[PDB]
From a paper:
The non-receptor protein tyrosine phosphatase (PTP) SHP2 encoded by the PTPN11 gene is a critical regulator in a number of cellular signalling processes and pathways, including the MAPK and the immune-inhibitory programmed cell death PD-L1/PD-1 pathway. X-ray structures demonstrate that the basal state SHP2 adopts an auto-inhibited conformation, of which the “backside loop” of the N-SH2 domain intramolecularly interacts with the catalytic surface of the PTP domain at the N-SH2: PTP interface to block access of the substrate to the catalytic site.
In this study, we designed and characterised a SHP2 allosteric inhibitor, 2-((3R,4R)-4-amino-3-methyl-2-oxa-8-azaspiro[4.5]decan-8-yl)-5–(2,3-dichlorophenyl)-3-methylpyrrolo[2,1-f]triazin-4(3H)-one (PB17-026-01). The crystal structure solved at 2.20 Å resolution provides detailed information about the interaction mode between SHP2 and PB17-026-01. The crystal belongs to the orthorhombic space group P212121 with the unit cell dimensions of a = 55.69 Å, b = 91.39 Å, and c = 212.98 Å. At the tunnel interface, PB17-026-01 is hydrogen-bonded with Nε of R111 in the N-SH2 domain, main chain carboxyl O of F113 in the C-SH2 domain, Oβ of T253 in the PTP domain, main chain carboxyl O of T108 and E110, respectively. In addition, the dichlorophenyl moiety of PB17-026-01 occupies an extensive hydrophobic area of the pharmacophore by interacting with L254, Q257, P491, and Q495 in the PTP domain. Compared with SHP099, PB17-026-01 lacks the hydrogen bond with E250 but forms hydrogen bond with T253; meanwhile it is hydrogen-bonded with Nε instead of Nη of R111. The interaction between the N-SH2 domain and the PTP domain remains in resting state with unchanged relative position of each domain. To study the structure–activity relationship, we compared co-crystal structures of SHP2 bound with PB17-026-01 and its analogue compound PB17-036-01, which is ∼20-fold less active than PB17-026-01, revealing that both of the compounds are bound to SHP2 in the allosteric binding pocket and PB17-026-01 forms more polar contacts with its terminal group.
Residue numbers in the entry: 4 to 34, 37, 39 to 84, 87 to 88, 96 to 155, 162 to 235, 245 to 293, 302 to 312, ...
């Protein structure tokens, strides 16, 4: 994902494409959640705007995508003008192993307290300015050790004192991950995993929120984004001709290996397993019956709607339930709206779902429709937390209840935010504040089951704020 330049300006982008790029070279850069796709063509540099308010990436005049990597992969194969040569960035800021300003004793303390065999980091050198240090832990009292390797910078190239000279710290790390250094007496300096400094004890959430607010939220979030290229899983079923009109957006698709299979078998939906979840899109008129088939088949008893039916005049979640006290059939599924109850932040609809001709199949489905999410993110997490707390208790009170359905819009943004908050709060509810939480890792685990779960930095920070607020109360 080297084609994304985090700290690049617009003038710097045009200069990079014109001096170190050729026609068809491209890069992406932040703006502000506005983004810019700068492409070189016919000796010129055209700029294309990409907007993400929290639901999806919207390319001006293009299509809508779940991740910039999926956007770039799409146009490097299909419709825009020409994306041929990604211009790679040498900035290590977004790497999981780069820590820039970091003391050598603090780095030894980190690797000792939180590291394992093969855990490593790269930092700016304590003494010799402009150089870097690669600190790596190895071993299984005295059974393990921390080894430091000086990384010199000479003529914009990097080396470990001998051998190849690398154009960037990343090339050096990748090289020495595949060909690890061997010490004199046999010790192999294997670079297995970056040091996990994002996993924190739950009681220390407020301290970390203070550090990240000094921002640090941005640096951690774009480090999470840099790894999305590892989540380009297969999405073939949602591209077949018969399933194109079942997707709200043609290029926001469910991963084949986690999608819900209807027993046609397609719906834009994925099972999220950390209580499990079904993350899906807002209904279309032609998928309402498939939605209810899914709810019935998976034995789901709770539904979370993340958006209003309409926001800013645009349909975000098509109505798929009957009016209060009414009864309606959706294909072979029959649904009665038994009762609606109005809270401040949401509406609760008690629905009874059954298959036609089989009254024995009847079950109650509790529909929780959140309605006070702004047209960015909420400034107070209390409403969302109280909402999820009630949702969790309803789910826990129903024996053998299936996965919780969370949906609306494209089903990746607010949907991923609610689900990740619910996963994290679930750990603290059962195990108290004396437990480990890891917000980036939890999101990456969920993004490997549906594309682009959690869309924006504002949602990423809101997840932290929600977890902090829950732990305080
Ligand atoms: C400003 C410095 O540069 C960035 C910086 C590097 C260290 N760091 C960090 N950020 N981060 C974001 C997501 C993930 C992640 C975790 C588990 C699995 C996967 Cl797949 C991922 Cl992507 C990680 C991660 O592991 N670390 C260690 C904090 C931010 C700063 N020191």
């Amino acid at each position: 994902r080297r084609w994304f330049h985090p700290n690049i300006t617009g003038v710097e982008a045009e200069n990079l494409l014109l001096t170190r790029g050729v026609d068809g070279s491209f890069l992406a850069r932040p703006s502000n959640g506005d983004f810019t796709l700068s492409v070189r063509r016919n000796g010129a540099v055209t700029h294309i705007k990409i907007q993400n308010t929290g639901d999806y990436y919207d390319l001006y005049g293009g299509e809508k995508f779940a991740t910039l990597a999926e956007l770039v992969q799409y146009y490097m194969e299909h419709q825009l003008i020409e994306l041929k040569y990604p211009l790679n960035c040498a900035d290590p800021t977004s790497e999981r192993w780069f820590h820039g300003h970091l003391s050598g004793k603090e780095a030894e303390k980190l690797l000792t307290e939180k590291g394992k065999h093969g855990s490593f980091l790269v930092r700016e050198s304590q003494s010799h300015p402009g150089d870097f240090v690669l600190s790596v832990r190895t071993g299984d009292d005295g059974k393990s050790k921390v080894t430091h390797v000086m990384i010199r910078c000479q003529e914009l190239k990097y080396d470990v004192g001998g051998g190849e000279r690398f154009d960037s710290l990343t090339d050096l790390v990748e090289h020495y991950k595949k060909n690890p250094m061997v010490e004199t007496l046999g010790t192999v300096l294997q670079l297995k995993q970056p040091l996990n400094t994002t996993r924190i004890n739950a009681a220390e959430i407020e301290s970390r929120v203070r550090e990240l607010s000094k921002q640090g939220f941005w640096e951690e979030f774009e480090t999470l984004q840099q790894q999305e290229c590892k989540l380009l899983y297969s999405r073939k079923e949602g591209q077949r001709q018969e399933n194109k009109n079942k997707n709200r957006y043609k290029n926001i698709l469910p991963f084949d290996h986690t999608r819900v299979v209807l027993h046609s078998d397609y719906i834009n939906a994925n099972i999220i397993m950390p209580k499990s979840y079904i993350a899906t899109q807002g209904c279309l008129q032609n998928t309402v019956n498939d939605f209810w088939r899914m709810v019935f088949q998976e034995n789901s008893r709770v539904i979370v709607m993340t958006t209003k039916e309409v926001e800013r005049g645009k349909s975000k979640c098509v109505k798929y339930w009957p009016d209060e006290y009414a009864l309606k059939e959706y294909g072979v599924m029959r649904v009665r709206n038994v009762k609606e109850s109005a809270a401040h932040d949401y509406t609760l609809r008690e629905l009874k779902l059954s298959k036609v001709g089989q009254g024995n199949t009847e079950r109650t489905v509790w529909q929780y429709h959140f309605r006070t999410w702004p047209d960015g993110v909420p400034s107070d997490p209390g409403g969302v937390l109280d909402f999820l707390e009630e949702v969790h208790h309803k789910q826990e009170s129903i024996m053998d209840a299936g996965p919780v359905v969370v949906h609306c819009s494209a089903g990746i943004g607010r949907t991923g935010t609610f689900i990740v908050i619910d996963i994290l709060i679930d750990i603290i509810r059962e195990k108290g504040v004396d437990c480990d939480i890891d917000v980036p890792k939890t999101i990456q685990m969920v993004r490997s089951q549906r594309s682009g779960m959690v869309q924006t930095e504002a949602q990423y920070r809101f997840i932290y704020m929600a977890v902090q607020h829950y732990i305080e109360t």
